[PDB]
Structure formats: structure tokens, C-alpha cells
Design a protein around this ligand. Structure first.
Ligand SMILES: OC[C@H]1O[C@@H](O)[C@H](O)[C@@H](O)[C@@H]1O
Ligand SMILES: OC[C@H]1O[C@@H](O)[C@H](O)[C@@H](O)[C@@H]1O
Ligand SMILES: OC[C@H]1O[C@@H](O)[C@H](O)[C@@H](O)[C@@H]1O
Ligand SMILES: OC[C@H]1O[C@@H](O)[C@H](O)[C@@H](O)[C@@H]1O
Lengths: 374, 374
């Protein structure tokens, strides 16, 4: 059901030609919402890494069965087991890096959990395989791009005193929106003599409870929407998480609430469709409004984390952000107004904001970096 | 007007006669909410460190003038300048560790800011003096206590599968309430071969905007309190920060709001008075209600940070906590119910909770630890 592309084979064959008995390679896996991607990397930068598989998977069983097939196909080409491996995924990581609890999968906690118990040894060696979180891997991919001097080819500034994106020794939030709200922290700890290169801190602030607004022009609408989602999602028992709005499903729910009272309102069934409705030459204000509330709440969590974590900058990552940039930039004043809506605006009015400018699987990029520097 | 303690002069003379010319010592300063404390430390455990001064100060001028007087008195006794120094205070630290902006002092940011060049060289050597944040210093004091096997002498468990307080390779929140809401993270980054001993991450989440509750019995009263404090503090421009409730001034503001309609209610003028009346309960326990709301909001921000930062434990520190422990324990069930009032209680219902059991300037302890290990 899963097959290694005939486009990747010549590169892998070339690796044997070149490295002969000394061949060693690392495995990276990116478990996306819809597709899981596998790439191999020799670890010398004069040989580009090679994406070997992309297959649809939405359950631990699918993911693991696919990885088993890919492993058998690599065994018939490279003929030597991988020397290390890293898998990135949308969930919490066990203390030892040997498990991943995929937060928004259906099923029991057992159903959502990937371990290395069923991973094929050929690609995932016993003592050198680790799971990491997806925004955690985004941070490693940013570190890798920056060490290769290519970061500015993939990110541009929206708020900055400079026209090019550079990473300093400072705290940076990294955010991406898809099946969930992903947020991680690139952090510089220690001052002066104690300073350490940027470390990656995975986080789960997508699931923190939301913060309200008192701006009268918005309080009424948000109060009604929050009450409506608490009702429909939790039967009133809890307030919403940021992720209940800042996600694919949240975009759908906000739009449905916006159009709850209009039968003739264009029905859509995915954030992708609602976004496309907001991006077309004459968009319907319902779609426009849903996306604005979505992004308002992304700016709301970002503003509180920038205060709390003393971030100097923010990266908006993800291929969907590339698609959404014209809309986000068209309403950047609305974004910035929400971001500065805080009793201490001087604490954050210099925080920089960078956005991804071309599609690129930075999660896979981070997974390979992790595996080969481990 | 600022004198070195008489009890301390013989201890310093003992160092002079013992180490003579080779005398090497470090300086710790704790800028507390009322008093600033100075201690000297040889760095070797065979000499207990010596607290040499405690003086009242509430502005940068008082602090610097007091430190100048202390430096002169040390110079006359010891005749050797300090080899390193560390100052802890309630605010943001400059990137180089050479400044501190005390958040809740009045005036301009310059009025609030201490730098390292205002400091007398005798106790604060060039290239070996740093400011750190107060809750950052609490963490360094916890690490020191942990390394000296004394952690359980100052903290007891409230939520734990164990009866002795330990610090493992995991994330811990550290919290203390006074002039402000202080929170810091002891973090262990890296899984597997990448794990690093606990690092300290200062934070400013006391100034993040609050989260509401939907528990219907509490929502109405909280909405009125939040709306009233937003009108009062910010003329309704913004929602309140956690610190607007979780602080000394917060305790006062909540108690005044609660008793607005009660002309005969006791007119307490300090959070300390209110806290006292809260446990020795008045026949109409308005003070009990204000302190319950205060701690509820402390639990709410802790709840969201335990989710977001994946904390495994929490330390409630500070001399205020020692005094309020009987109240806090009496209402621990209310505390836990707020903490677990989240759509994902399984994520945090194993989080451990420790409280400080005796008064101890852990901040000063951490500053000395920072100075002698830098
Ligand atoms: O699954 C990861 C992503 O891969 C992309 O190629 C697909 O178009 C998306 O639907 C998917 O979310
Ligand atoms: O995929 C983005 C984020 O979604 C959240 O729901 C998960 O809990 C996170 O671990 C993940 O980083
Ligand atoms: O200033 C730090 C602390 O010093 C103690 O001696 C006082 O009891 C407190 O009121 C004060 O906050
Ligand atoms: O003192 C507790 C806390 O008060 C806050 O208002 C300050 O901004 C923090 O830096 C400090 O840690």
C-alpha cells in the first residue's frame, strides 16, 4: 500500500556508491494531520537528505504499519540499518522520548499513544530512537535553517526594526495552527557568563483556558461565542481552551456560530474551505469574520505568552500560514491591536513577528536535525 | 542610618584573622518588599554565611544609599573587596544581568531601575556583579537547599504520593505572593542523552490576563469583580492581570469590593490584617471570602501554567505562605477543585504541590548560591 518513490532510489543508490562499507544514515518522520512523511539523511551536508515516503495515516496502527513497509523497502535498497531516528508528532512526549500521546486523535489514551514497541528496528534502532513534539521539531528546524544561514529564505518580518529575519540569543515563541494550536519556546537561559545556545522547550499552551476582552465593541460578541462553545463542547462545565477556537475545527465552529441564524449562508465543512472563502476576490463577511476571530485569539494567547515568557520575537510557521499571509497582512492592524491590548503595552510593543514565506516541511527538517545531532 | 549588625562584626573579624590576605567572599542582596538584606559568604561550607545588614527601603535611592553605607562598614572590617556579587529583586532583568526594573515601584522606568554602576565597587566588583529576579532567586535557593539535602526541612507536601519533598529531573513551578505574583520555572530540558540538570527560567505570568470560570455558582460574582477591577484599575480598557487579584493590593481590593455594601464590616487596611481575620474567622467572614478568591485565582494561573509548561510539581514559597498555611490547608479542597476545573483534569491531577513550612529568606540563599557558582 506504501511504496518508496522511484525518484528517491537514485540518491539512495548513490549513497552506497559513495560511502560503501562506511554508509550510515538517520531517519526522520513527520506525522502530520493527514500524511506521515519519512526522510533519510546521511548527515553530511554535501549530500541533501531524501524524502522516501508519504502516506495517509490517521491512527497509530496506520502510522506503524506504514513505517514497517517503508522499512522493508529501505532494506532492499540500502541494506544496512539506520543509525538513529526521530519522529515528530502532535502530542505530549513521554519522559524518556520513547512515547508520543497524540492529543487530538480519537479513541482511548492507549489508541492515541505511539511507542517504539511496534517500530521496525531496521529504521528505528533500539538505543537511538526518540519521539519529539511537532512544534518542538519546528524549533529544531529553525535552528537548522539558521545554522546553515538559510533562515531568511523561509521567513520574512511583519513587525521588526530590520528587513531580514535573524535569530539572536533571545527567547522566541514558535506557533503553528492545524489540528491543534502548537506553541514552543526557543529559549536562551543564563545571562553573560552563564548564557547557553538556544534550547527548545515544548509547551501545551494551546490547551490553556482563554482570556477575555473588555473592549466594548468586542466583549458582547466574544462573551456570547465563549458561552456558546462552552455549552456545545463541555455542556457548560469549563471555559474553552484557546485551541477550541485556534484550530481547524475552531474555524469551522466559529463560522457555524456566525451563520447559525442564516439558512442561505454558504455551508462549509473545513477550515480550508472557510479560509478560501475569506481569500477570494469578493469574500463573504461571515467567512472574513470567522478568520478574524480565529486570528484574534491566536494573537491573544501570543500576547500573554510574550508577557509571561518575555519573548523577543514570534515565528508563525506552517504551510497553511504561507497560504494565509495575504489575509493576515491585510488585517495586520487588527492583529496588532489585539496583541497590544494589554495594561503593559510597553512590555511587548517591540516584540518582533516573523512569518513563513514559502512552503517547506520544517517539522521533517527538525526531526532529521535532532536525529543526527543526538 | 544603616548599620552592620553588631552580632555580625565578630564573624567577619574571624574571617579576617583566618584567611587574612587570601580572603575571597561573595555578596548576596535580597531586595524584599519591606527590607533589603545583605549577606556575605566565603563559598566554603565550613564557614556559615553571615547576614550583615537589614534595612528598610522602598526606592532605588534608599537601596543604593544603604548598600553604600554597608560597603564602607565592610571595608573597615574586612579590608578586602568582594570577589562576586548577586542582587535579587522583584522585576525584569536586563539581558546582560546588569540592570533590574522593579515592576511595582512608582515613578518612571528610570525611577524603577537599578543598574550595576550605581553600586559601590567594594561589595559589587566590575565584571562579577549581576541582578536576578526574585523568583529566579527562589529557584536557585531551592537548588542549593536540594544539594545540601535540606529541602524537606523547609517544605512539606500537600499533594503527593510521597511524604518527603524531593526534586527530580522534571519541571517545577515556583510561586510566591507579596508585592506581586511571582512565578518561575525550574526546567529539565532534553530527553535521553540530552537531559541537563534543572535550569531556572524567570517568568512574568503574574501580568498575564486572567482566565474566567464557568462553574455557574461562581461565574456571576467573578464577572462583577473582574468588571469592577477593570473599570477601577484601567477604566475598562483591558481585562485584569492575575496580579491585580493575586497580590497584597489584590487582597485589599477584593476585600473592599466584597464589603462595599456592608458599613459595619471591619475596615482592615492591610492584606496582613485581612489574612489574619480570614483564619480567626469573623462572625461575618468577609475576610475569609476575599482570601478564598485570592487563592482561587492563584490556583487558576497555576492550573494553566501546569498545563502549558507540563509542570510535574509546584512550590508555594515565601513567608506569607508560611503564615497562611493553616487557612490554605483548611480550604485545600476548594483549592484543588479550582486547580482541576479544566477540560483535561487527567493532565494535571498528578501534579504535586509543596508548601514552605518555616520562615527562611530563600531569596537571599539563592543570590549567594548564584554568586559563588558564577
Ligand atoms: O498531514 C500533513 C499535511 O500534509 C499535506 O500534504 C496535506 O495536504 C495536508 O492535508 C496534511 O495536513
Ligand atoms: O499540533 C499542534 C499542537 O496540538 C495540540 O493539541 C497538541 O496537544 C500539541 O502537542 C501540538 O503541538
Ligand atoms: O521585606 C521583606 C520582608 O521582610 C520581613 O522582615 C517582613 O516581615 C516583611 O514584611 C517583608 O516583606
Ligand atoms: O515579586 C513577584 C513578582 O512581581 C511581579 O509584579 C514582577 O514583575 C516580577 O518580576 C516578580 O517576580
Amino acid at each position: 500500500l506504501v511504496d518508496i518513490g522511484e525518484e528517491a532510489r537514485p540518491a539512495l543508490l548513490h549513497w552506497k556508491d559513495r560511502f560503501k562499507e562506511s554508509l550510515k544514515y538517520f531517519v526522520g518522520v513527520d506525522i502530520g494531520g493527514t500524511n506521515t512523511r519519512v526522510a533519510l539523511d546521511t548527515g553530511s551536508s554535501d549530500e541533501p537528505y531524501v524524502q522516501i515516503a508519504k502516506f495517509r495515516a490517521s491512527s497509530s496502527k496506520h502510522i506503524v504499519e506504514g513505517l514497517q513497509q517503508v522499512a522493508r523497502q529501505v532494506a532492499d535498497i540500502l541494506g544496512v540499518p539506520a543509525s538513529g531516528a526521530c519522529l515528530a508528532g502532535a502530542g505530549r512526549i513521554g519522559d524518556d522520548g520513547l512515547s508520543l500521546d497524540i492529543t487530538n486523535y480519537p479513541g482511548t489514551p492507549a489508541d492515541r499513544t505511539l511507542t517504539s514497541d511496534q517500530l521496525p528496528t531496521y529504521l528505528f534502532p533500539a538505543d537511538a530512537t526518540h519521539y519529539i513534539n511537532d512544534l518542538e521539531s519546528t524549533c529544531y528546524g529553525l535552528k537548522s535553517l539558521n545554522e546553515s544561514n538559510q533562515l531568511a529564505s523561509f521567513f520574512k518580518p511583519l513587525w521588526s526594526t530590520s528587513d531580514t529575519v535573524t535569530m539572536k540569543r533571545a527567547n522566541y515563541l514558535v506557533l503553528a495552527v492545524g489540528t491543534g494550536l502548537g506553541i514552543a519556546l526557543l529559549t536562551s537561559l543564563g545571562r553573560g557568563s552563564r548564557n547557553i545556545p538556544l534550547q527548545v522547550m515544548p509547551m501545551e499552551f494551546g490547551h490553556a483556558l482563554y482570556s477575555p476582552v473588555t473592549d466594548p465593541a468586542k466583549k458582547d460578541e466574544e462573551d456570547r461565542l465563549a458561552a456558546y462553545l462552552s455549552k456545545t463542547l463541555y455542556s457548560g462545565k469549563n471555559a474553552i481552551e484557546y485551541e477550541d477556537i485556534v484550530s481547524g475545527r475552531g474555524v469551522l465552529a466559529v463560522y457555524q456560530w456566525i451563520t447559525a441564524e442564516h439558512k442561505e449562508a454558504a455551508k462549509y465543512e473545513s477550515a480550508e474551505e472557510i479560509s478560501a472563502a475569506a481569500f477570494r476576490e469578493d469574500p463573504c463577511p461571515f467567512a472574513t469574520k470567522a478568520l478574524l476571530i480565529h486570528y484574534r485569539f491566536l494573537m491573544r494567547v501570543a500576547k500573554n505568552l510574550c508577557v509571561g515568557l518575555q519573548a523577543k520575537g514570534m515565528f508563525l510557521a506552517g504551510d497553511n500560514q504561507v497560504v494565509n499571509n495575504p489575509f493576515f497582512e491585510k488585517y495586520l492592524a487588527e492583529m496588532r491591536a489585539e496583541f497590544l491590548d494589554h495594561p503593559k503595552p510597553d512590555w511587548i510593543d517591540k516584540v518582533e513577528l516573523y512569518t513563513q514565506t514559502q512552503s517547506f516541511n520544517i517539522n521533517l527538517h527538525g526531526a532529521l536535525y535532532y536525529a543526527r545531532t543526538d
